Design a protein around this nucleic acid. Structure first.
Ligand code: X0F
Ligand code: MG
Ligand code: ZN
Lengths: 867, 49, 71, 162
DNA sequence: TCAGCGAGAGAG
RNA sequence: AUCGAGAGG
DNA sequence: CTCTCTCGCTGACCTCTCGATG
């Protein structure tokens, strides 16, 4: 019923037309009897009834009297909600300027005229508004514009502002206030308390101040006081008004009972706590809940676990409806009583009304769009929410005390949007790059790594098996080891040119664990993808290959089976940690003693002058760094390989089965740098300014530190913690600015037709053009031979084909070189990284870009203290 | 789910009656903001035509 | 229709129109009163509509033709 | 390096990108800014595609001069004038930081929502502006369907009836 | 506090 | 309701 | 014409407990 919003300056006639009542001199609510004063800030006649369809005196109390004003009160009978709508006005007894149009960086009420801000401010403060009003009203804009145009970096602004007044239909003399509007009463209410006293707003004080001072001016005019006394009071009123509009523009801040500045009208629409940022861009909602999160290792990828105590409250109207449908209740209170009493029949209605209704889960710092996702509920006992292990990394979630919030969609369109857009089975690739987001970690990686390793002279080595099922039988019966090397008959499938699957069978050298693991791999993948020891990268590559070849639906099943098998086989190994696993090399003492002897000998070159006083520093630092490297290398060489194993009589070497080494090598949690601190040397520290302390820490964590080393080590810890704590705000501010600059960019066209582009050079070339469209003519390296036709989308096959011929460089289309106005076109954008195909029409790419840039800086923030 | 006084009641009644459809209106905070800006002596309004 | 909706996307054409088509079909069954073109199998109207779209019995042109025939 | 380097590259701080655009074309500034930002982001091992930086850069440069007006308006006027076989216009492109680019937009509701409410409201009241509600924030504030996704088609109907 | 920017006087 | 103090992600 | 130099003005996610004062 509307299509635009208009803004302009007001006039006294407009303000008078808004009002429902005249000026209001009296003050307040008559604290004794709560009925409001006549002709006041709270007044029944001016603003409306205090109760629905009832007069102030009470003579009329019926709907039949609707539309009748009271003869003795003057109060109309109407619904009380009109008290939110009607306004009022106050008749000032002297012109008063507007603080907004006077005080600013490009002052307006003082730029139409020639004089600068200092002298005009002196004039306004009686050292008069009437003179400025007369000067403004006694000017001709057209003649001034003609003279200025004929005369011609300082006059262009005046010409533009004068033209703005001419075109806008305003008057330059409307900047001086004459009538003051009065805001409706229910938007500044008076709140009662448990005690007799009341709590009031700041606005009701500023109105009373302005009213009292203006009335004080009224008496002086009647009494004909000398102008000396009058001139003082005129300066007073303009001081009061400037407080009501914007307090503190010229420092005179007015306080109340406490020593705190009062809040003006301009303070309620601006800032982090104003109407825009607190009530219009975000708010509180119904049908929502909150709780602590635990882990559920049995769920499927599209499920979540919800407590039934929360579910009963969250779905109340649906249960009421289903109860009334079956006749189990008649009125609207019988169903409420049945639900409150928690009968045994509501627990089946609730089960029926959640069968295929999704819910939304959200975690508090929402850095990108993967922070809200949709699941299907499973009713559980308890008070905590159960979350799938494979969706934690996208949430940046953990089980240390974390919390989460839950929302319920209501309409059919919302349910279909949740199922088709936000469900967790649709979000498997990142929208900022191409790599997947659901990846196994920790326990799953350790379990698969343990299954896929091999040993020497293990139990059952040297058998010939008919298939994986025989291997499972042999392992379960206790007749063979998981690490034994054997021969197994394997059948695999490959896709042909037409897309059909063709089988091939042979015998292969492998281990029992790999043959056991082969039974969960989908048809269409080679056997070599598991005939090795698996780590994080290998498993992620397996998932990506499956998605590339087979599609979306098999990938979910494959991922769930991988997780189940990893959990199952990590527990059977009994992997633990002890103090004897932190092995210290036997040559640490000799290296440290040699380094100490070297640094002691280099002091003889300084006792008798032979080197610069600033030259021994670098030599000592280099000596200690070399010693640290030697110690670290010795430790890691002793840890990685330790077999001394017997093979059919002889002695042989192989990779070790140390718990810490396995944890680090599999890629589960550890790093090679932290094993150094555990069993090597802690190293060189730094001073708070940034300089390097001359002597290092020669102790690891297995053999403890002493007081001096521990005291030295705390500087960096506190510095890192303070850095983490004090610069999340920078990332937040940057992300907000990036979102605000580009929030209205949408794909609104299909083909721009322009021929421009950019030329891409190798970072490999394949990773830099995968998912773009060729802007101009590109051909094969041979002369007059064309490899790829122009305007083609480069998927994996095209990239492999161009990499086979060693393509030098390619030209592609870009978003920045598009002639479309109000938006961009699909082909200049290219592939949509979250799906794989080309971009669709109607997608907000600006918000996606802003989130993609903003998120990594924030995540970089809070991980500093880990090091 | 917030600020629509008539829409919330209509939605509740429709859900109880088994019909999952909504009839949105205008939030109240926008009206509050319009009145607050008008109280500063600035004319702001919606252009129906 | 269940767990994954990728089958119907390749038939309608894109994700943003599938929601509208499915909602229009489902409101006919929930409130208007109509019978499904597939076995019900104890499902909600949204899932039945998605199943009908996946089979090939429902799209925008069919609904328009049926509405024209009704009037 | 670090966060301040990125926060200073996007606001076009003077040490030049201005001269790079004015002398070698926007095609060069695109590559320059992309490389400079990816230099900071690649030390820590962060992977971001190049499209998003290009989007932000395109949003950064949006005005023109021949006072200062909108680039698309000038292009449309030139197309209209050349349709009648007349003389068009010649313009020189500009470039602003994101904070300044956001506050200079055709919509005053979004600008007032961003920051510096008083200055924006004062200028709008002086000029007597109109807002057509063509963005995401305006429709969010009023309470309508945003012109994207499942609501996009909806807005297409409105234009058909105007 | 600290960082950043424009408006306004100076001394040539 | 505002102010002050503390705690968790 | 054109570098220096003061001097203001605006900016820096979600949840829980207590008391004192309106
Ligand atoms: N001031 C803050 N502002 C903000 O915006 N988010 C914050 C925050 N403080 C904590 N978080 C959130 O909490 C996570 C790390 O805190 P934490 O649960 O202890 O796990 P952590 O990785 O540290 O490992 P642990 O301590 O268990 O050894 C962190 O990412 C973040 O999301
Ligand atoms: Mg946590
Ligand atoms: Zn009466």
């Amino acid at each position: 019923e509307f299509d635009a919003i208009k803004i302009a300056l007001a006039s006294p006639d407009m303000i008078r037309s808004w009002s429902f009542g005249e000026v209001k001199k009296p003050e307040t609510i008559n604290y004794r009897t709560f009925k409001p004063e006549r002709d006041g800030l709270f007044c029944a006649r001016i603003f409306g009834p205090v109760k629905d369809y009832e007069c102030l005196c009470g003579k009329y109390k019926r709907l039949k009297h609707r539309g009748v004003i009271c003869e003795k009160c003057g109060v109309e009978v109407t619904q009380t909600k009109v008290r939110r709508e009607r306004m009022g006005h106050i008749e000032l007894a002297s012109p008063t300027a507007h603080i907004w149009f006077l005080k600013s960086l490009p002052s307006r009420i003082g730029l139409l005229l020639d004089m600068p801000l200092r002298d005009i401010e002196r004039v306004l403060y009686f050292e008069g508004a009437e003179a400025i009003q007369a000067l403004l009203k006694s000017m001709d804009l057209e003649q001034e514009c003609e003279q200025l145009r004929e005369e011609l970096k300082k006059l262009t602004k005046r010409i533009k502002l004068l033209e703005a007044f001419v075109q806008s239909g305003n008057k330059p003399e409307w900047m001086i206030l004459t009538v003051l509007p009065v805001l409706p009463p229910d938007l500044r209410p008076l709140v009662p308390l448990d005690g007799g006293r009341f709590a009031t707003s700041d606005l009701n004080d500023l109105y009373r101040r302005v009213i009292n001072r203006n009335n004080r001016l009224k008496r002086l005019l009647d009494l004909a006081a000398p102008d000396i006394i009058v001139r003082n009071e005129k300066r007073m009123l303009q001081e009061a008004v400037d407080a009501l509009l914007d307090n503190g523009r010229r420092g005179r801040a007015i306080t109340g009972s406490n020593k705190r500045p009062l809040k003006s009208l301009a303070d309620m629409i601006k800032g982090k706590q104003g109407r825009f940022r607190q009530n219009l861009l975000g708010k509180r909602v119904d049908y929502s809940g909150r709780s602590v999160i635990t882990v559920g290792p049995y769920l499927r990828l599209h499920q979540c676990g919800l407590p039934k105590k929360m579910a009963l409250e969250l779905f109340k109207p649906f249960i009421y409806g289903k109860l009334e449908l079956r006749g189990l209740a008649t009125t609207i209170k019988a169903a409420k009583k049945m639900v409150e009493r928690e009968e045994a029949v509501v627990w089946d209605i609730l089960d029926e009304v959640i069968r295929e209704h999704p819910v939304l889960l959200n975690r508090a710092p929402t850095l990108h769009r993967l922070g809200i996702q949709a699941f299907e509920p499973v009713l559980i006992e308890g008070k905590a929410i159960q979350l799938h292990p494979l969706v934690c990394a996208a949430y940046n979630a953990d089980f240390d005390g974390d919390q989460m919030a839950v929302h319920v969609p209501l309409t059919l369109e919302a349910q279909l949007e949740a199922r088709a857009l936000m469900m967790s089975t649709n979000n498997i690739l990142s929208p900022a790059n191409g790599e997947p987001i659901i990846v196994p970690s920790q326990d799953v990686v350790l379990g698969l790594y343990y299954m896929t390793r091999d040993c020497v002279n293990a139990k059952g080595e040297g058998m010939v098996l008919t298939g994986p099922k025989e291997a499972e039988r042999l392992y379960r019966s206790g007749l063979a080891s998981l690490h034994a090397r054997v021969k197994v008959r394997i059948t695999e499938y490959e896709k042909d040119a037409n897309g059909e699957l063709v089988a091939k069978t042979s015998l292969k050298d492998t281990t029992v664990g790999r043959a056991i693991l082969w039974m969960i791999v989908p048809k269409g993948l080679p056997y070599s993808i598991v005939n090795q020891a698996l780590g994080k990268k290998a498993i992620s590559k397996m998932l990506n290959t499956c998605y590339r070849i087979l599609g979306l639906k098999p990938t979910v099943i494959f991922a769930d089976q991988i997780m189940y098998t990893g959990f199952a086989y990590a527990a059977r190994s009994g992997a633990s940690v002890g103090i004897d696993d932190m092995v210290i090399p036997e040559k640490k003492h000799e290296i440290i003693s040699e380094a100490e002897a070297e640094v002691a000998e280099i002091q003889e070159q300084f006792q008798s002058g032979l080197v610069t006083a600033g030259e021994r520093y670098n030599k000592v630092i280099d000596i200690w760094a070399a010693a640290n490297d030697r110690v670290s290398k010795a430790m890691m060489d002793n840890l990685q390989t330790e077999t001394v194993i017997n093979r059919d009589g002889q002695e042989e070497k192989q990779v070790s089965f140390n718990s810490i080494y396995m944890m680090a090598d599999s890629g589960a949690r550890g790093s090679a740098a932290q094993i150094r601190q555990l069993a090597g040397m802690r190293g060189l520290m730094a001073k708070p300014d940034g300089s390097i302390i001359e002597t290092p820490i020669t102790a690891n964590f297995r053999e403890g530190l002493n007081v001096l080393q521990y005291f030295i080590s705390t500087h960096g810890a506190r510095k890192g913690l303070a850095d983490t704590a004090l610069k999340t705000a920078n990332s937040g501010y940057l992300t907000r600015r990036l979102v605000d600059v580009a929030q209205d960019l949408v794909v609104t066209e299909d083909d721009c037709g322009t021929h421009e582009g950019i030329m891409m050079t190798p970072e490999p070339l394949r990773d830099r053009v995968l998912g773009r469209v060729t802007a101009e003519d590109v051909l094969k390296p041979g002369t007059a031979d064309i490899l790829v036709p122009r305007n083609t989308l480069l998927h994996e096959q095209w990239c492999d084909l161009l990499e086979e011929n060693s393509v030098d460089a390619v030209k592609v289309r870009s978003v920045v070189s598009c002639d479309t106005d109000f938006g961009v076109c699909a082909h200049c954008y290219g592939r949509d990284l979250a799906r794989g195909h080309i971009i669709n029409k109607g997608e907000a790419i600006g918000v996606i870009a802003a989130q993609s840039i903003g998120e990594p800086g924030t995540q970089l923030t809070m991980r500093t203290f880990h090091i | 789910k917030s600020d629509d006084v008539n829409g919330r009641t209509k939605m509740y009644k429709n859900i109880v009656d088994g019909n999952h459809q909504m009839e949105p209106g205008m939030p109240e905070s926008f009206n509050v903001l319009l009145k607050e800006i008008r109280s500063l002596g600035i004319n702001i309004e919606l252009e129906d035509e | 229709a269940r767990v994954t909706v990728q089958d119907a996307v390749e038939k309608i054409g894109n994700r943003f129109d599938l929601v509208l088509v499915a909602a229009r079909r489902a409101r006919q069954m929930q409130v208007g009163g109509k019978d499904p073109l597939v076995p019900e199998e104890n499902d909600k109207t949204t899932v039945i509509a998605l199943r009908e779209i996946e089979e090939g019995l429902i799209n925008n042109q069919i609904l328009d033709v049926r509405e024209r025939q009704e009037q | 390096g670090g966060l301040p380097r990125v926060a200073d590259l996007f606001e076009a701080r003077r040490p030049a990108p201005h001269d790079i655009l004015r002398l070698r074309g926007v095609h060069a500034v695109t590559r320059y800014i992309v490389n400079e930002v990816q230099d900071v982001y690649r030390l820590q091992g962060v992977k971001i595609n190049d499209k998003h930086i290009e989007v932000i850069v395109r949003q950064m440069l949006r005005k023109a001069t021949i006072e200062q007006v909108e680039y698309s308006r000038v292009k449309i006027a030139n197309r209209e004038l050349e349709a009648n076989g007349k003389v068009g216009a010649t313009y020189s492109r500009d470039l602003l930081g994101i904070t300044k680019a956001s506050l200079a937009t055709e919509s005053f509701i979004s600008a007032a929502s961003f920051q510096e409410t008083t200055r924006v409201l004062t200028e709008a009241a002086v000029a007597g502006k109109r807002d057509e509600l063509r963005g995401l924030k305006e429709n969010v504030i009023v309470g309508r369907l945003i012109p994207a996704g499942t609501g996009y088609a909806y807005h297409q109907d409105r234009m058909r009836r105007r």
